[PDB]
Design a protein around this ligand. Sequence first.
Ligand SMILES: Nc1ncnc2c1ncn2[C@@H]1O[C@H](COP(=O)(O)CP(=O)(O)OP(=O)(O)O)[C@@H](O)[C@H]1O
Ligand SMILES: Nc1ncnc2c1ncn2[C@@H]1O[C@H](COP(=O)(O)CP(=O)(O)OP(=O)(O)O)[C@@H](O)[C@H]1O
Ligand SMILES: Nc1nc2nccnc2c(=O)[nH]1
Ligand SMILES: Nc1nc2nccnc2c(=O)[nH]1
Ligand SMILES: [Ca+2]
Ligand SMILES: [Ca+2]
Ligand SMILES: [Mg+2]
Ligand SMILES: [Mg+2]
Ligand SMILES: [Mg+2]
Lengths: 551, 562
Amino acid sequence: QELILSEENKTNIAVLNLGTNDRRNAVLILETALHLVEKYLGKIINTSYLYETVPVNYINELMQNLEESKYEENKELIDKCEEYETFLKNGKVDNSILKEVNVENYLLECNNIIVKNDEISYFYNLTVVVKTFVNDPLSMLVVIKYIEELMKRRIIDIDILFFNDFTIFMKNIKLEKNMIYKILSKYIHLEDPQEIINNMVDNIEFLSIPHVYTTHRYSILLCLNDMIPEYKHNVLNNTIRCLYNKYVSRMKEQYNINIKENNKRIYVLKDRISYLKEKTNIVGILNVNFVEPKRAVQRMFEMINEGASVIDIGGESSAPFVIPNPKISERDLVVPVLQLFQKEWNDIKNKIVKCDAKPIISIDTINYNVFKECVDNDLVDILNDISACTNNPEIIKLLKKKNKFYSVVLMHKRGNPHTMDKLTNYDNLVYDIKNYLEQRLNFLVLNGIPRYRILFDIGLGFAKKHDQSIKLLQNIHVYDEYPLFIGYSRKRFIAHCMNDKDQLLYQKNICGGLAIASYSYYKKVDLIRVHDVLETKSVLDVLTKIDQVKD
Amino acid sequence: LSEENKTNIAVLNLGTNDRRNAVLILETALHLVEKYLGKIINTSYLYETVPVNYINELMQNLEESKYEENKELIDKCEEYETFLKNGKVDNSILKEVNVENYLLECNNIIVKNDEIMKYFYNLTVVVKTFVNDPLSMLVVIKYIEELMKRIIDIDILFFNDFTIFMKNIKLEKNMIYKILSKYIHLEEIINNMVDNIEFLSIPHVYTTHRYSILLCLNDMIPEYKHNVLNNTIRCLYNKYVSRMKEQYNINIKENNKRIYVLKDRISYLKEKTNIVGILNVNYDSFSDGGIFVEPKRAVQRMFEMINEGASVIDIGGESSAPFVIPNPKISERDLVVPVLQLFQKEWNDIKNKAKPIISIDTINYNVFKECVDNDLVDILNDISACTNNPEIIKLLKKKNKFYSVVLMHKRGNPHTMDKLTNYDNLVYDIKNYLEQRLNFLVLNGIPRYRILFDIGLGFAKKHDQSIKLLQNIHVYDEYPLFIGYSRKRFIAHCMNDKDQLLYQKNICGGLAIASYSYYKKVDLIRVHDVLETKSVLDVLTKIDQVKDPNSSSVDKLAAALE
Ligand SMILES: Nc1ncnc2c1ncn2[C@@H]1O[C@H](COP(=O)(O)CP(=O)(O)OP(=O)(O)O)[C@@H](O)[C@H]1O
Ligand SMILES: Nc1ncnc2c1ncn2[C@@H]1O[C@H](COP(=O)(O)CP(=O)(O)OP(=O)(O)O)[C@@H](O)[C@H]1O
Ligand SMILES: Nc1nc2nccnc2c(=O)[nH]1
Ligand SMILES: Nc1nc2nccnc2c(=O)[nH]1
Ligand SMILES: [Ca+2]
Ligand SMILES: [Ca+2]
Ligand SMILES: [Mg+2]
Ligand SMILES: [Mg+2]
Ligand SMILES: [Mg+2]
């Protein structure tokens, strides 16, 4: 009865599904659940993209009033997780403390639930892998229910897809109200904190591991495919990917349905849903290299009104052979600017209808101290790390708070402003860069950064000869699955494109970049980082008009 | 030979190997066909198909024709209409073989050629011919070839509905002469000519065997059905195309390219988007608030456009800009001829050490005449599609030169056009309209491959109609396409030092249409901002320039294996 509470400290692997119905607040709801998962269950070491599929204020108050977890939070960076490796390859783990069933019983008891439900809205999903300290899936389900109830004070559905290699079907669970309190107290410092426990007792009816709908719901396979394509559970007839591929082509050969069209991958730049590949956002460049705060802030507002969705501020040139002037530090160039902008914006904020009108703010820095100060003072939304967080990976710690995730651009480069033009050997240029960006994403994702908040940038001009920059453009389709951010603006390789004073070359350069804006638009590049906002907006508006068929 | 005063319909084929001079050679041939055989009343595109200074001084000393050249415009041709439908015609003076005997006499020549063995530029033509019979025409044709002396081959593909095969042919060194003097004032060459003419086949033997004959004929007479053929030209053409795809896995069109001509050189249809720079003399001179025309500044602008990358200059002195009232004191001709004259001068001064094609945006015959006679221009840009004065068409042919023409669609004039925007079917009414204009120039001997289409963005179109014409630009995929969006109001309609932002937005909006045009493979775009447009096209072109067409798949496999 209380052998479910035995002293033994163990680490298990759980795979969860988080679903909501609320389009408006999906991000905030799912990420609140991510936070509570990380607080109350263990460590997030994988996430899928966010998807939209076809079959408020008290949250911010809740996060202030949470009971502490009996268990540690360790933010140190990890580079491998052994239990996860073991989970993936089906290696040896401890016997389940809960009674298992064989394949036949499971398959039978699954169908029986499916058929019953076959007698008797947009969904927003995300899956998670958690390195858990919770002893067993039922205990987990109790805590998961606590979390769902916290978030009500429907709105959030949290299912257990997997839990080690276990196979479990328990038909008639009834847990006495004091047993629930006893389970929650093992994991939480329990201290109205008692009345919640009442609602939970009728909620746990049975427990199926794997979850009943795991292979029967497209939206689950979609998420799992992002994270664990090669996983094979005893109870499944193939790997996650295979099962996923079959589901796609079957709907193409049992109906005439391309399932992808109804089920959209999402990325998040700040706090809203963006559908992958549906819009080319302009990112306006603000180089503060001496540029006076007031003037810098004027330029920011000129760019908002010229059409920029995002402003990318940098205080440190990375341009070829640039030696900076130590007279003034990066911090002192960027912070006063972002503070002034935050002031001006808040003055003129409550005078007009301007909240969604606020540009997402991006900082082009590799330096942890700079980003720590921006993040502490709520001055930025995105980290633009031209070293893909390799220069100081501690920075990745700054992308999470108790109730906040920040998004990040990972760019590819080699060397520094002085050596980079000399480091241009690649066995397989297009794929070496892709593979590198994937490894960097895997490292962030292993360390709890949501997959959907990570953007890829091939870094044109950084350790690329001009013909290699072009070739990276020519092959941009290899990023069709990923949120893609590129920066071609006023780079050398553009001039390399023309045939034959500096004002004439300045203009050829702006104009050559409008060509790459056109190309980008058709290639459905998600973000483009540009100096010339007005010009870029004009181009994208025209091309959008040409594409819009009128009724 | 005895019969007199009859008119016949004959289809010819013209061929050469000289890529460098295909235009000059086929165009000379044409001139001579029009001099010595009748009126050219149809042409095909020029095609490039895989299976020098002699001519200038030749043009001066030619023998005259016995029938009068007739440059008058026509709008139908009953005979030709009768040729197409296969209606009652006179009986053949030469001896007709029947169908099976023709079929087997042909196969024989084809088969003997298959065995006997162990870039082409083509152009078909239809002739309303005074000449009496296939064989006489062949004699005159052989004279024309030798008169041009392989350098030029001119076969006879049809003569009315005749089904003819003549097995053995000796023509007396003097029997040729009497035929040749029936049509010319003869003033050495017959010696060379004798054995040349061995036999005679009508239809020509290779008529349905050579793709490059079908291709050419499909332009002109797609629905034509000869007794000898199993179906219409269009069907045999389609069959030939699909069967090459099914049976040999070959896209026959890749090696058989449609050509259009701007000046003197070959252009490959859909292979390049050409910049055409705009020189408006009214705007160049009177936008200051100034009152005097400045030819120097104007010719300075021409040179500045050549260097910025324009392949073509479009000069105009009338303004069709909406609600714009042309200046009544200084005439079009005085805005235009002087600027052109100074240009041809300074071009010839700086010609020690590339010459831009010159287009003139006029609907006025007298203006065009003075320009063409003094060799000031290469192309007629007629925004009325030659309906303001169809006689302007005559000026597109000389005895030696041909000139190219842009036909634009419009309704009304600059004060009325904006109100004239009801179309039963916008996209197709305009295309049909342009097509019917082309049928009219062609019926009058304007070479097909010298006619360019322009939908006329902004000319009697609402802004959404201009966009719609762009959305549906693919309907011109078979045709040489010339468009002008530069700075038109419909660009602003696409958007969301206040007028400078608006003029910036407008140049930039255009560069977007330049890109779209580039990808839609528009042949010519007429622009104000040349440097900007060239920069755009250069960059798009470099992105498309692949080193190895396979590497993307190969590098992908290499990566997967590692
Ligand atoms: N792996 C698992 N994860 C979550 N709940 C499970 C489960 N196995 C069994 N259950 C039972 O089913 C209940 C889940 O309730 P809900 O999630 O609200 C049903 P639903 O969302 O309408 O459809 P779903 O079960 O297909 O998600 C749990 O309280 C528990 O009684
Ligand atoms: N309908 C026709 N038109 C032109 N020539 C014809 C003809 N019927 C027979 N001939 C004769 O056959 C010859 C045709 O071949 P030529 O033009 O001389 C070189 P070819 O290109 O190798 O032959 P091809 O064009 O038949 O392939 C002519 O010289 C002509 O005397
Ligand atoms: N992510 C990113 N940041 C940059 N910062 C400066 C110059 N280029 C770039 C670039 O191309 N990408
Ligand atoms: N052919 C052509 N000519 C023009 N002349 C003036 C203005 N626009 C145009 C145009 O769009 N097309
Ligand atoms: Ca944790
Ligand atoms: Ca004639
Ligand atoms: Mg559920
Ligand atoms: Mg030949
Ligand atoms: Mg021949």
